[PDB]
Design a protein around this ligand. Structure first.
Ligand code: FMN
Ligand code: FMN
Ligand code: MG
Lengths: 215, 210
């Protein structure tokens, strides 16, 4: 029983796989829906972790709503977001590893901007028995926007903000019949290198998303 | 513009009978505002009306943040590292500080004092009917690597506070998660054990009228 708590085996030597598809510079996303969908109370009942997935990609509508749920602008006045953040600073940027490329989600313009023309799915650097899925979200902390915050609270603020955003994604997945699993076992430096992140950018959590496997 | 620390403010005496265990009505609702609606209305509120939350609303709020959504296995509404509770949720009420027990869906008196707005920082958040306090229990993380305990408890607490924010958006309540905490001072006020530390506090109530 305690054996589940043993630290996971590191995955050594993996390189980014070649991009599959057309690795477009910008992917424009459709406007997210505002009225309809499963009641919040229903989504809380069904909120769970999934580790085996079907490989079918999310339709563009679902990719859009997921990204908006996690990191989107919900108030035009001031660019308020669907999730909180310390001092209103955008401390977390959401990246998306798709088979066609690694993208950064831009909330103000609700689109994806190419960060790397490579498939960086399941590059957490640890064997946590989470299978291959259509996409991974990576919640990256931007230390450049945290310098007016007390240093000893930055990991708590980054992790809490990332947690809230990952929770919005979980709840969206539950509303839309999708599986999700947040993953904190990250070789942060290795993943930061694969993602071509700047020195002040640190991966905090990832989240593997897709339709749950058929059996 | 950066928040300043406030001096030693002592806790207020509890108002009421301070019952030792409060039974909460069983969580059974599956209806209410669509998730997308709650996401659209998710925001922080800092000025509140003082009217207490009815029992049913308090029960639902606690269940959203910390409750059992799967009876067999004790799976929770929020994720947790290794499926083990690393966060204990406390509720600071006028009548006393209570610990929410997810398995029995009830409140157990922790201290007969009013500990609302005991963060130790001046973040301009007004008095509200209650605070939720998310406590990292390091006693339940001794087999987890030290370097991950802060990230995992903070990410678990953030998800729980997020479920709470969303519930508040669905119910027309205001909420604000607060992370600027003098943790040691607040832990002392809460009578927490040495290996338990408040990491986030969340002030909740109806938004102020005038
Ligand atoms: C901060 C945090 C980090 C997590 N890290 C991982 C991880 O690295 N790998 C994994 O498979 N699951 C991870 N999980 C998921 C938990 O294992 C999962 O929440 C737990 O099994 C309970 O299942 P449930 O989400 O269905 O309630 C993490 C959860 C949290 C809150
Ligand atoms: C980790 C974290 C800690 C926070 N701490 C405080 C705090 O101590 N005091 C406060 O007034 N607000 C706090 N907030 C709330 C943010 O200031 C707020 O989310 C931000 O201003 C944007 O407003 P919004 O929540 O309406 O989107 C915190 C938010 C996060 C994510
Ligand atoms: Mg203990």
């Amino acid at each position: 029983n305690d054996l589940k708590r043993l630290p996971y085996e590191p995955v050594k030597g993996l390189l980014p796989r070649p991009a599959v598809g057309t690795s477009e510079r910008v992917i424009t996303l459709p406007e997210p829906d505002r009225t309809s969908g499963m009641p919040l109370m229903g989504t809380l009942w069904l909120r769970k972790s999934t580790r085996e997935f079907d490989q079918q990609p999310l339709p563009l509508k679902q990719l859009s709503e997921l990204l908006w749920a996690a990191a989107g602008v919900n108030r035009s006045l001031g660019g308020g977001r669907t999730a909180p953040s310390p001092y209103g600073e955008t401390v977390i940027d959401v990246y998306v590893a798709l088979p066609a490329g690694l993208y950064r989600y831009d909330p103000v313009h609700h689109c994806l901007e190419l960060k790397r023309a490579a498939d960086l799915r399941s590059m957490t650097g640890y064997q946590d028995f989470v299978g291959m899925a259509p996409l991974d979200l990576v919640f990256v902390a931007n230390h450049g926007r945290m310098q007016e915050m007390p240093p000893k609270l930055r990991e708590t603020f980054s992790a809490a903000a990332a947690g809230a955003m990952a929770e919005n994604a979980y709840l969206y997945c539950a509303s839309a019949g999708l599986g999700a699993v947040v993953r904190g076992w990250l070789n942060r430096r290795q993943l930061a290198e694969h993602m071509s992140l700047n020195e002040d950018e640190e991966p905090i959590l990832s989240q593997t998303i897709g339709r749950a496997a058929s059996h």
